[PDB]
Structure formats: structure tokens, C-alpha cells
Design an enzyme around this catalytic site. Sequence first.
Site, PDB file in Angstrom:
ATOM      1  CB  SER A   6     -13.907  12.005  18.136  1.00  0.00           C
ATOM      2  OG  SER A   6     -13.603  12.318  16.788  1.00  0.00           O
ATOM      3  CB  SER A   7     -17.239  16.491  16.478  1.00  0.00           C
ATOM      4  OG  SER A   7     -18.439  16.890  15.839  1.00  0.00           O
ATOM      5  CB  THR A  26     -15.661  22.588  19.985  1.00  0.00           C
ATOM      6  OG1 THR A  26     -14.783  22.230  21.060  1.00  0.00           O
ATOM      7  CG2 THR A  26     -15.902  21.369  19.108  1.00  0.00           C
ATOM      8  CD  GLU A  66     -11.483   9.117  11.927  1.00  0.00           C
ATOM      9  OE1 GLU A  66     -12.429   9.737  11.396  1.00  0.00           O
ATOM     10  OE2 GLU A  66     -11.644   8.306  12.864  1.00  0.00           O
ATOM     11  CG  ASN A 106     -10.366  13.191  21.735  1.00  0.00           C
ATOM     12  OD1 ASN A 106     -11.318  13.164  22.514  1.00  0.00           O
ATOM     13  ND2 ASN A 106      -9.427  14.128  21.788  1.00  0.00           N
ATOM     14  N   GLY A 160     -11.062  17.225  10.442  1.00  0.00           N
ATOM     15  CA  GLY A 160     -10.017  17.074   9.450  1.00  0.00           C
ATOM     16  C   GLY A 160      -9.793  15.638   9.031  1.00  0.00           C
ATOM     17  CB  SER A 176     -11.420  14.854  18.111  1.00  0.00           C
ATOM     18  OG  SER A 176     -11.889  14.870  19.448  1.00  0.00           O
ATOM     19  N   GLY A 177      -9.948  17.208  19.840  1.00  0.00           N
ATOM     20  CA  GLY A 177      -9.023  17.584  20.884  1.00  0.00           C
ATOM     21  C   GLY A 177      -8.099  18.732  20.540  1.00  0.00           C
TER      22      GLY A 177
END
Lengths: 667, 373, 373, 373
Positions: free
Chosen positions: A148-149, A102, A373, A145, A371, A97-98
Amino acid sequence: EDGVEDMTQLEDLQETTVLANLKTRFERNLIYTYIGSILVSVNPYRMFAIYGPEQVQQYSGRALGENPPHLFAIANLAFAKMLDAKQNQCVIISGESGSGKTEATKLILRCLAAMNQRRDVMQQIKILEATPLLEAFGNAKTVRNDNSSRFGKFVEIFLEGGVICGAITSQYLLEKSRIVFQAKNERNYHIFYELLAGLPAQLRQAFSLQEAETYYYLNQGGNCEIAGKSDADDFRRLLAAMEVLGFTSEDQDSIFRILASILHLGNVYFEKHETDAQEVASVVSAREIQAVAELLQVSPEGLQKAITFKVTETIREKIFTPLTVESAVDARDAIAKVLYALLFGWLITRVNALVSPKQDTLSIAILDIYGFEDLSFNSFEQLCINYANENLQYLFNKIVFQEEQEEYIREQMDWREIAFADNQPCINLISLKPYGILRILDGQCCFPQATDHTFLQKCHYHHGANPLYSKPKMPLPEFTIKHYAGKVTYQVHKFLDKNHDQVRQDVLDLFVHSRTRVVAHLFSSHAAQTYKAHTVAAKFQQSLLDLVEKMERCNPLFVRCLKPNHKKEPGLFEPDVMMAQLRYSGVLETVRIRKVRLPFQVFIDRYRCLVALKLNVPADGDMCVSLLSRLCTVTPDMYRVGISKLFLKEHLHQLLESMRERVQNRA
Amino acid sequence: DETTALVCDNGSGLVKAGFAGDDAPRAVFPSIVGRPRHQGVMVGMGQKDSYVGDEAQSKRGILTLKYPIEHGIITNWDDMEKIWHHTFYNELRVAPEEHPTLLTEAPLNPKANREKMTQIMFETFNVPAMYVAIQAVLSLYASGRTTGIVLDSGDGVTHNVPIYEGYALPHAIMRLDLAGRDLTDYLMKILTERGYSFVTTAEREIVRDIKEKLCYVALDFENEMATAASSSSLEKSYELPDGQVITIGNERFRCPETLFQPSFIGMESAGIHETTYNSIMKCDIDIRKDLYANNVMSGGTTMYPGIADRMQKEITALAPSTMKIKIIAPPERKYSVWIGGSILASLSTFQQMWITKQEYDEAGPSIVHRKCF
Amino acid sequence: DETTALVCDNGSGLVKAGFAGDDAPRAVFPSIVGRPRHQGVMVGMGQKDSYVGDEAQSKRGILTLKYPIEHGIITNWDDMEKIWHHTFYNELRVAPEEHPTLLTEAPLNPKANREKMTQIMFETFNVPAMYVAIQAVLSLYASGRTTGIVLDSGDGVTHNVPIYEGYALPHAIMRLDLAGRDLTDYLMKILTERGYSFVTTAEREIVRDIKEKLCYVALDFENEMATAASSSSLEKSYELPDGQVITIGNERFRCPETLFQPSFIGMESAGIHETTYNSIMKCDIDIRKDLYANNVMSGGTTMYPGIADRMQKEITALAPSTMKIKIIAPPERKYSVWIGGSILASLSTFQQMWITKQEYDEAGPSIVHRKCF
Amino acid sequence: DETTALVCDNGSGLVKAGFAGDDAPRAVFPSIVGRPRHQGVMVGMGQKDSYVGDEAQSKRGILTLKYPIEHGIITNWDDMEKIWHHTFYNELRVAPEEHPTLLTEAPLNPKANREKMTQIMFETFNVPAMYVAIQAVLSLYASGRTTGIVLDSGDGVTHNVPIYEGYALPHAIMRLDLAGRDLTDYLMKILTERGYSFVTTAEREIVRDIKEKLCYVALDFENEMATAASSSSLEKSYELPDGQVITIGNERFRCPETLFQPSFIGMESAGIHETTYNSIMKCDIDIRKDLYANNVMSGGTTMYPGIADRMQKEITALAPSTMKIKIIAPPERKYSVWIGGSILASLSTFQQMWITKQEYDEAGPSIVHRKCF
Ligand SMILES: Nc1ncnc2c1ncn2[C@@H]1O[C@H](COP(=O)(O)OP(=O)(O)O)[C@@H](O)[C@H]1O
Ligand SMILES: Nc1ncnc2c1ncn2[C@@H]1O[C@H](COP(=O)(O)OP(=O)(O)O)[C@@H](O)[C@H]1O
Ligand SMILES: Nc1ncnc2c1ncn2[C@@H]1O[C@H](COP(=O)(O)OP(=O)(O)O)[C@@H](O)[C@H]1O
Ligand SMILES: [Mg+2]
Ligand SMILES: [Mg+2]
Ligand SMILES: [Mg+2]
């Protein structure tokens, strides 16, 4: 120009060499660097003058091979393969994320939309304007983040001869446990707070939605003050965007009612009440139960019967079995879980239905998959993320090995009998039915007297001396699994409270009698379409298996995203973050498989004046390496040489100083 | 993939069958093989020499109902095979050639029973894998615990199997041959006192249904004996399937009292209330703390209303005062064996404990005595 | 820095472990290795072939309790290693790879015991430094003096070690093999007179607990023998862990009388009261002045109420009249060995007296016979 | 003159009575008190509420057989008095008012048993003089020696009493509660494997008779376990008293193997073969020379053919190689206790060791604990 942009062009592949090359590249804004058919990228943490429309047009076709690496090149090559093979393929993007994944997907979507003259059609933008709802439903606060998705995004858009046909979007992975339980200093999905923020006062007082500080499903992390960061404006924007889709106001009210009922489900309190022979269940107040029933317009007595009693029935008899406190709480959580999951499924189905789908033509698929984590305390959710990333890394390793094999074949034909490990034991440790960790947990879920600690003993005995299994030295309630990114610990706590769905048939039959069309139709469709999906782990494994059996017949191409800094620091690169991102993304698996093709002519000619060995080799072939072997007892492992390359150079590491020292000793 | 191993509880009375994972059996019907006895006259109405299952319950007026299982020992095999074939094909509509099967079987039955059962289900049906378990352990699974004394009493047996922390105590298992069938026979023989006669096998089902619907267990036997002769409040009526209505007085609770005073039917052994106490005091000393508090019971014959109170009172009278007695009576006792079997068959760990066809082929029917138990 | 050397008293019965400097052990639990004996039936409840420590005290109803130490000689090593591994990792949660350890060990035990102990604790656990001391000297440290006769009687030994001004007298050390285990066995064999039988190893713990709670030492044995047969005031009751209550009469003080009349269990050697006197008169002449006045005792078996009076009376009767007899009975005798070990290990001067790994590597297990003692 | 003192061996099973001096008991019959259970209908066939002795062995089809002695402790006195009255009057036809009586009694039984026995036989029967002895010592007398370890195992006890040169060793006496009754119960529970059920007390006698006639002790247990599954030569048949004939296979030697592997019935203690070894190594050192060579055994349960060979082999395996092991197995073991009692009661020297009525009157029942032992 002094640097190198393709990892294949590099002779010796080292992690230090890779990081140094990237650090030399990033100043010149070489975000994209080739590693062959795989391309990576970095986040500049800023905006850039956008790749203009010219990069789409004159850099397509064969020109991408000679062009500097760029995002449009992979899409152009994918379309070229569409034209050449007339088969469907996929493009998979990874990262944390970040990292702009996206935004990268949006950029590639607008690139593939603008590559043709059909840009004057609104359907190419209607898919993009229905996007914000998805990451609104998918983003929750995380320690790494705030945005975060936590879901898997799949989009499948048909393109017939460059004409963009209907687009079908789908979701595979979803953290259903985050609906009811949240980690410390973490929030739920942003929509629950947005309903609090942006709802009208009259609807708030009609639904009694002012108890966010009281709702058990939102205060788990103890952090609700971040909900004031323009969440009301985000709510208004989301409503405007979904009204652009034409979603009727009554259906919006129904959605709000269902969400309010889901939130109020956390207000149900269960207590140990001695009914007949043991303490079973009790409710402090039925007012919350009545409100939940009225929100979905369902009989309160039926809901109370379903949440407090487990019913078993057959052709002849129907018997109610009282449920303990823990089982009642688990069922109350699971009903909310399935409600939210099916709401998301219905909404994504509505989004896919609004845009008209066309027939089966050529198409390109894009997967927005988060990805690797690794938090400080890894829970069951992190275990699921790691399993999914392990499968994705297995696919990446397969593709990388295939590319390396074709490179070797182009080099020499005697490399066909060369094979390496394919990460199978790591997957089999968890996915295998008899003694998989997830399978063991699923079996232990239904066991009569099962606690978190007994699961530790079962895992420790069943696996034991497995090389990838790392038993903790000290008696702590945790274990460690050695993935491709290194050893990762997992603190075992509330796994049994997380891995349980067990939705009963009576619960499903009660809701289809509601006077609201949406939920009744959705539950009827869910019952019609539905195997062994007893627990959350089984559903996650089934979804991952569905994704892989959708993907395997495409031979897709991947792109990797990286975060050069832990937070928003533009243009700052440091070695530790580079190593962490490389380990997380599995890029080092490429050099692991590779361990290359150095011609010895450069080495011979470089020491022409110092060693004074003859530089006059008329035929540069096997004689040089044979002489080196005769002078240094080189093993037969240094054979199968191609024309003048394919030297692994393991003995050269110790031979270089051996030949260097005697020359320097002369002075 | 998931083979969805079957669980077919073959009890002395009803038979429960279904798939593993579900929480309820998919097939409940009496295990009765009936044969016509009268002389057929209409052409085309014969050629049916065996009615098996529930279809033999409605046409019982011209059939002779024979139970292939008595006291829990399979005394007839040619019709037991017919019952199994019915239960699989005509009821579950699943071919056992690609589905494992899990059987239920009494603790202290003869070994030849299990050996012949294994031979039948591997040779005829060609089941890929089969296992045999003990009904008490599955019932204990169904109760959500791992420590207690299981009292299961179906239609042929009444056995106590104490289990502590997952470890069985074979030296404390006591099996009693007083069950529902003897209660039905005693009710049939005691109904003749009021003038009601049930001679043929077709009326045995009527007697059994009367027992199921109207019988109950008294709290104090002598007190209700005194009450019945001085009032008519205990009298209730039942309707036979011909129109005439019978009235039953003090025979409602004098029928199940045989389970506590088996001297009524000539048996010398004491009732289950004292059998459980004697089985508990055949174990160690530091275990009774849990056994007196986890008295789990199951079986069909234990839903007579009032049994969980009289049993508790009797055990409390027998047990020392300082100790606490608790009775676990789930509302689904008669299906607890099938629930436990389904829970066991759904475990991924148990998949290694199957008896595959190769082991039976290389070992023979004797492999049951080593693998199953 | 400060390594905080551990002190792990491995007695015949309980085991005391903790850190040096503190005034109380951090881990007290019986040293019992138990193995399941019954047949497991539930799937997933097995795979536990050894319950070690206090966790084997609650599940003893299905286990066989074996003491790895008897009479003070380690007769079983594979389970003693398990006990040590438990005591370190599962109890103290400290890795012995960076912590010195100090052991306690009986005076006259075989040398092979110490050699094997040293081999085990240097090879397996890889302890950087280890030392072995005598329990009597540590007990004397715990009493805050440097002169006296130490009578330590745990569960396997009963040894007298006279010390004067910090100098030991090896020629006066007498060790007796009568200890708490023999008292427990004699109580078990004498309880059968009243009708109470304790046959299996699980009831040995009940007998031991009865001895710990209700037993006491009579002042005059014959007087209480006469009193018990003429009154019921001495009778007291204890409750077994099953609900039944037993009553014990004159067996409360007839059990510990074996320590003073060891002819009860067939032993010929006299009681400890005369053993101490004979050990004192094996020393010099100008030393008894202090030995008769510093009769320090320790060990678990010396808290029977009344021992410090009968022992003093017996020694006064044996000793000359002009001399004064004093008995030192601190209220924490059973932890005195650990207290002395902690006091010793906290001394900075003792840091030179360790056996580091280099010396053992260059010398072998035989270095214990020169460095430790 | 010569009073001809009686000897009435009251064992757990049979009862032996007779006169001193003779070499054989004059009365052998089971000690069973039976009471009718059915409803008498014929007038004049009732009024018999207690059948005592051998007359209750033929009419057992309508009686409930209760043993007044279990494990060797007299748990029922009102019927034990009836048995004694029968044995004297209805069997020996001698009034005990002018004849001394000598009883036999287990080593480690409760004292209250002996006290109540003494009270009964002095108050009710008014016997002029009575004495109580230990069965092991009388058995050793019957073997014609004064040094050996006596292993007597009747129907309630199995006790080892080592004697050397007429001196007993009370610290080495070990008593085991595994005897013929447990063997009968295990045979009854193991016969159900083949399909034979024996539920009521009347069939316990059939099981006991089967054990007496057909059972035997295997030499190597595993070898015969392998042999039985591969042949039918070991199978033998017995006829029930109704006409049907049963066949018994490997249950002939699997029944008495409990005496060597008591883990079969849940007992933790090892078999008698190791119990004797542990009792021998609880004595002194210069005595085992004779104890290993004088292993005298008696009791009913020791005539299973092959016991004297397996026991010798096991003891030789346990004992050191250099020593010699001998087993004394007289052909009249079950009457050895009575033979020894008759030999003792015929000695003129023993006449001073009686307990006359005056001493009991002036002392009470407590005199047994001082005079008899
Ligand atoms: N409500 C009831 N009251 C009394 N007896 C009952 C009742 N319901 C069932 N039974 C008895 O239970 C028996 C069925 O037991 P079953 O489930 O077949 O046990 P198993 O499966 O072990 O053979 C029937 O014979 C019937 O007499
Ligand atoms: N209050 C008590 N009365 C009598 N005996 C006791 C009492 N407390 C403990 N004991 C005995 O002390 C023994 C424990 O001694 P322990 O501390 O293990 O000595 P060591 O450490 O030298 O082995 C136990 O076996 C127990 O029988
Ligand atoms: N031939 C035999 N084989 C096996 N057991 C026997 C045989 N003869 C007798 N017994 C056993 O011996 C027992 C009788 O022992 P008994 O003489 O009563 O001892 P005690 O007199 O000490 O009670 C019976 O219970 C029977 O089981
Ligand atoms: Mg049953
Ligand atoms: Mg000590
Ligand atoms: Mg005897």
C-alpha cells in the site's frame, strides 16, 4: 450493445441502476465507462491483451468522442486541450491499493511517450526506471493490502509540441508518524527490512544491524515474518536500478549509515531519574548513542545534550532546560521523523536532477493519490487521509457541478440560478483556525497538562450540535465525523504522542558540523529554505494547501480506480463491494448533485393501448405537463421545462401507480 | 493568515520582546531613559536629548538614568512611549499596525495604569488587537502545570498568586513591594561600611552588576554571621570599570537576606517565606495537598544561589511535619513570563479572547476591566 | 429474553446501582452535584459547569456541593436528572431504552415526587418498564424473613414499617425526619466547642468522614459522661487533609446520642428506641409475639458500634419482662435495600407487576398510586 | 453594702468598662497592645516595651499594633492580662479585690477560652465574684423587650440568637465569622485600585477611620454601580494625617456590601440578610409572628447609613407577603451590650446567680459550663 456506457445517456440515475449497468458491462470487458468528463475503471485482477499501438494513433483527436471509452482517450483529449489552450493542466488518478493505479499510471506514461516519433530517446524510459525506488520508499504493510502506497506522488513532465522535455517529480503527503509508530499487525516501510535482508555480512557486523527483533521501530506490529518474501531479491534489484542512475557507492554507504542510525535511534532508552527536584531523564547505556553518533560522524556529547536537554538562548544568555521522559522520547522520535523525511526529499531531488529539466513549456501533470481509507480502528493517520480525500472530493464536486451546469446550459438557459452544497462545512470543521479539530489538537499540543481525554472534552464542547459531528452515545474515548462516504469513527489514542515535531535549532546546528557532506549540505539547504511548521498536522495542512494552490489554475481531469473484489478474485463482482467502492470514491456525489430529462412522448406512447389516452399530440410541449398538473395538483417545482426534457419526475413516482391501478382494476 | 502576535514583557527592570511560538525572547535590554546633563562644546555632538535602551548603558557617564517604571506602576508616560517605540521599531523592526500585541502586567496595580496603557497602544501605535495578562499565570504556563502557588518577584513587585486546576483565588493574592530595586539600594547603603561610596545613578548599575555576579543566599544566617568574623574564605573581589579592585566580605549574603527579614530596610511585613505560608493558609483545606507540593517560583531575584534550599527549609519548618514540600526552580525563571506569554499567544483557542479595535472604539478604555480580567 | 432489569437505589446520601440477580451493587458513589465558584483564568480549563458523582468529591475545594435530595423529598429536578443520566451512562454503560428499572422510595413521601419521578423516567430515558417499591419491604427481603418490624434510617428519613406474614400495617407506620444529615450537622456544631470550625460545604465531607470513622454509640450515656471528664482513654485523633491533627474527646458518642435523645437538636419527638415500641403497640395483640423477636434494622446510620446493644436494652426496659427481645443486625445493612431490590427484580412472578409503557401512556403519571402501591 | 459590680465588655475591637447602674460606659478605647520596633538612640526614652490602650494609638508610628483578640477567640493571654490590668487600674482606678465583675463573651466560642478567662480573673486579680453572659441577651435587654431575634455583629463575629419570651433556642443559633475586621481588610485591598497603598499596621487604623467616617450601605447595589460610572456626585474626599487628600468613589458602598454578598472575600456563606431568614425558619411555627416583627440588631458594624432599609427590604422579599417586617435600630447599638450588662448587674435578683470564690475553689474552672450557661 444492449447496455449503456455513458451515465449521461442514462435517464434516471440510481445506485441500483449504476451497479446493474456495471455488472452488465464487466462481462464484455467494458472496464472504462463514461460519466461525462470523468472516467472510472475496475481491476480485472489479471492481465489483458494490451491496448495495442493502434489505439494511440487512429483513436486520437476527435475520434475519442465516438470511440468506446479507453485509458488513452483522456490523454489524447488532454493533449488536444494542450494544443488548443496553450496552458498547463493535470490528470489525477485515485483509488485504493491493489487497484492497479500504479500500473495505470505506468500505462498512461508509456502511452504519452509512444504518441510521438521521439520514442528513440532514452530519457522517456529513464523516468520510468527511476520509479521502483519511489514505491520501495513508499509501500508499507497494511491490513487491507501488504503493498500500500502511503505517500502522495506528483509528476510534472513538459511536452513542447509533442517532444517530451524534462520531467520533475515531487511528493506532497507522507505519513511521518508511521516511521516511529505502527498499528497492530502492520509493518514499517519495506526498505528497513530490505537493509536487514540484503546487506553484506561485513557491513552488517560493522554497523551492528542484526537487532531487527530488538529495534523498537520495527517490532511495533509484531509481524516481521513477511520480510522473507523475496525482499533480498527486491533489495538487489533496487540497488541495480539505482546504480543504473549512476548513484555513487560512497553516497550509498552514507545512505546506509543514515538508515542504520535512524533504526538505532529506537534503541535509546529513557528512564525516570531524580536529578534535582524531579525525575527528568537517564540512559541505560551510551553504546547505542555512541553508535548513532559515529554512524553520522557527529559529536556524541552534543547529541546527548540535544536529546536530554532543551536549550533556550538569546543575545546575552544560553540556558539548558532538562526535559521530562515523555518530551525526550517525543524529541527522539521527531528527529528520526525529520531525518527520514529529509532523506526522501533529498533522494527525490537527486532523481529530478539526474534527468535534465528543460524550460517552461506545455506540460501534463499526474497525481498518484490514494483514495479513501477506512480501517477497523481509525487513528490520526486515517484522519489525515480522510481530510486529503475530502479536499480531493471537493475539487471533484466542483468539476462535476461545472459539467452539470454546462449540460443544463446546453439544455436551457434558465438553470443559471440553480446551486447545490459544495462540501464546505466538512472541510471547515477541520481546517478553520478558531475551532478546527486539527487546530484544536495543535493548540492542545503545547498546553501544560494535556492528555488524550481532555482533547475529547474540548472537541465535544467546541463543536457540540454540529450536524456533521456525531458525539458518541456512550462515554468512549472516540468520536465520529460524517464525511461524504458516511459516518466514520476515530478512536482517540496517542494523538498527542503523534502530533508533535518541534525540531530545535541546536539539533539542526549540530548536524551541519558533521564530516559527511551529504547530511551537512541537506540540513543547510533545509535551514536556508525554512513559517509555522511546529507540528505534523500543520505540515500536512501546508502541503495540502501547496498542492491545491498548484492545482486550482489548471481545471484538471480525474480518473477513478476500483477494486471489484476485496482480494485477488478475477472476474468476481458482488453488490456490497460495489457499494463500498462507490461510497469511498465519491461517485455518488454526481447523482446527488443531479437530484432528469425524460421526454414525455415515450411515456405517453407506451400506454397507447391500455390507458387509451390520445397518442396524437401534434405539439409535445407544456400542455401535457399542464394537464397532468390540473389532474393531480402538481407543484410549481415541476417547471422550467426545456424543449421536451428536463423533468425531475418526483411526483411521477407516486403518479405512476395512481394511473396504473385504475386501468388494471377494469379486468 | 498567521499574524504572529507579539509578546512584549514590560517589566520593572529589563524588557523582553519577541514573536509568539518561539521559545526565547528576541530582545532583552534594560528599560532606561537617559538624558545628557553636561554642557556640550563640540559642534555636531549634541541634538540627542534622549538615549533609550541599551545604547544608554554605555554612555551613562554623561547621562542621568531614570526608570519610567517603579514598583510596577508606570509613573512616567512620555518616556514609556519612547521605550515602546524603540522596542518596536529600532529593535524588532516590525510595524505594530498589522501585528497583535500581548502585554504583561502586575496583579494588584491601579486600574488607571491599564487604562492609559490601552489608550496609548491603540491610539498612537494603532495596534489592531491587544490583550493584558497577569505575569503569574504566564509563569505557571511556563512551568508545564495547572496547579501551584506562583511566587514571581521581579524588580518592582513580589506577588503570590495561588492557582488550582486553572481556577484563580483572588482572595489569597498577596503583593509585596520588596523587590530587586530595594536589594540594590540596601547593597549600596551597606557597601559604605567598608568605605565604598556609590552616589550618582551611574554607579547604581555597578552595584546591580555586583549583586548579580557575587551575591548569594545563605542557608543559616547566624551560622555564616559567626563564620565570616572568624575567616576570610567568604571574601571575594570585583573590579570596577576604572581599574581599582574592591573586596566584599559578609555583604554577599547580607544583601538578599532582606527578602527573608524585611525589617532590615524598615519594612514591617515578614519575608516571602512566611508570606507564601500565609497565602497558602488563606485557601481551602483540600487544596493545600497540591499547593505544598507545587511551589513554583519565577522572577529575576530568585536565582540567587541557595534560595531554593532556604525557602524549602523555612516552609518545611512552618508547614506540618507529615506534609511534603517541593520547590520548582527551572533554570530559566527570568524568561518564564515571556515563555508563558508566547505559549498563550500561540494558542488558536485564545484568538477569540483578543480585544479588537472595534470593541475598544465602541466601549473605550474601560473595556480592559471586563475583557482582560 | 432475560432483560436483566436494573435496580438503582436513589437514597438521600449515596446511590447504589446494579443488575438484578447479583448480590452486590455495581456502583456506589455520593449523589452530589457540584458547580465551580471561583474565577477561571487559564484558557481551556473551564467549560465544566457541573461535576456529578464521585468526580466532584476530589475537586470539592473549588466547587459548591449541593444535595438534590433532602429529607427524602427530591427538591431539585434539573440536577437529579443529571445524576440519573450519569449513573446510567457514565457509570453502568447500559442504555435504559431496553432495560427495565426498579426504584426505591420512602414510605410517606409526597405523591408529586413519585409522579414526577415516573414522568422523568418514562419521557426522558424512555425506559420500557418501571416500578417503585418501599425500602423497608426490600430490606425485610434482604434479611431472609417475612415477619418483623423494619427500622431503616438512611440520610434523610427514619421510618418504622411493621410487616407480619407478608401483610403490611399502614396504620402503624411512623416516619421520623432525624437521620444522618442532622447527626453530621450536630457534630459540626459541637466540634466548635474544642475550637475546630468547619464553615463551608467542603468541610461537611470531612465532618461526615470523621463521624463514619470515629463515632460510636455509648451503652450508658451518663456513665460515659462521668468517665470522660475523669480520664483520657476515650480520646482519639484524626488527621485533616492538610497535615494538622485534631483530637476528639467525648464528642464521639455525644453525636449519635441524638438518635435516642432528639431533644439535643430541638426535636420534640422521642428517640427511635421508644418510636419502635410505640409502633409495635399500635398493632394487634397476637402479633407482638413475633415483632418483639424480629426487630430487623437497616440503613447506614445503624452501624455505629454499640447501637444493637443499647437499642435492645432500651426495648427490653420498655417491653414486659416475660417477653424476649431480639435484634437482627446483618453486617451489610447499608446494602440491604439494594439486595432486596435485586432479589425482588429477579423473581419471575414479579414480571407481571411491572408498569409497562402502554399503561402509563393510556393512564398518565397517576398510575403509580394504583399499581406501585 | 452595694458593691457596684463592674461590667467590662471585652469585644474584638473596642473595650467598654464601667459601673453597674449607669447608662453609659466610663471607658472606651481600642484593645491594642503595641511594642516598639525601631532602635532607640536617646538615653532615657526607652524602657517601655508595651504601650497598652489609647496611649498606643498616638505613638503608632513607631509601634507594631497587635490585636490580642481575633474572631472573638482570645489567641494571646500575656497581653490580654495586660489589657485587663490597664482597664482596671490605669483607667477605672478601682481595685477588683472588692468588686464583682461581669464579662461579655461570644455564643459559640471554645470552652477553653471561658475556662482560661475564669482562671485569670480569679487567680491574678482575685475578684470576689465573676459571671459570664452572652452579648446577644444583654443587647436584647438593652432594647426593652423579651422577644426577638438579636443580630449582633462586632469586629470578630456575627451571630443570630433568637429569643422568645425569655426562652433561648440553642438549635437556631448561627454564628458567622464575617465582621468589621474583614470589611477593613477588603477596603484596604480595594483602595489599591485607585492607587492608594496601606501596607503596615499603622495604616490599618487610617483605613478603619475612613470606613467609619465615609462608608455607607447602598439600597440597590446594581443601580448605584450604574450611577457611579456615569456621575461624580458619590465621590468624597478624606485627608490623611500627612497633608495629602485622597478621593474615594464607588468604594464607599462596595466595602459594606460584603456583609450581604460574602462571595467578594471568598466566603461561601450567604449574607446576614439570608442568614437571619434561615435562622428564623429553624424555629417553631407560631413564633415567627413575633420574630418577623422584632428584628433587633446591634453591634458596631450596623450603623452604616442605609443598613436598616436594605436589610428590611431583603427580609420582606424573602418573607411571605402577608407578614409584616420591622427593624429595630436604636441610635446606641454599639453600647447596647454594655447597657444590657449594666441593667443585668443592677438587678437584685441576679445577686444569687454570681459565681463566688468558694464555688470556684471547690469546683475549678469547669464551673463555668454549669453556672454561667
Ligand atoms: N544572578 C542574579 N542574582 C541576583 N539577582 C539577579 C540575578 N539576575 C537578575 N537578578 C535581578 O533580577 C532583576 C530583573 O528582573 P526582571 O526580569 O526585570 O523582572 P520583571 O521582568 O518582572 O521586571 C534585576 O533587577 C536583578 O537585580
Ligand atoms: N460506620 C458508620 N458509622 C456511622 N454512620 C455511618 C457509617 N457508615 C455510613 N454512615 C452513615 O450512613 C449514611 C449513608 O446512608 P445511605 O446508605 O445513603 O442510606 P439511603 O440509601 O437510605 O439514603 C451516611 O450519611 C453516613 O453518615
Ligand atoms: N459609623 C460606623 N460605620 C461603619 N462601621 C463602624 C462605625 N462605627 C463603628 N464601626 C465598626 O464597629 C467596630 C467596633 O465594634 P465593637 O463595638 O468593638 O463590637 P464588639 O464590642 O462586639 O467587639 C469597629 O471595628 C468599626 O469598624
Ligand atoms: Mg514579573
Ligand atoms: Mg434507606
Ligand atoms: Mg458584639
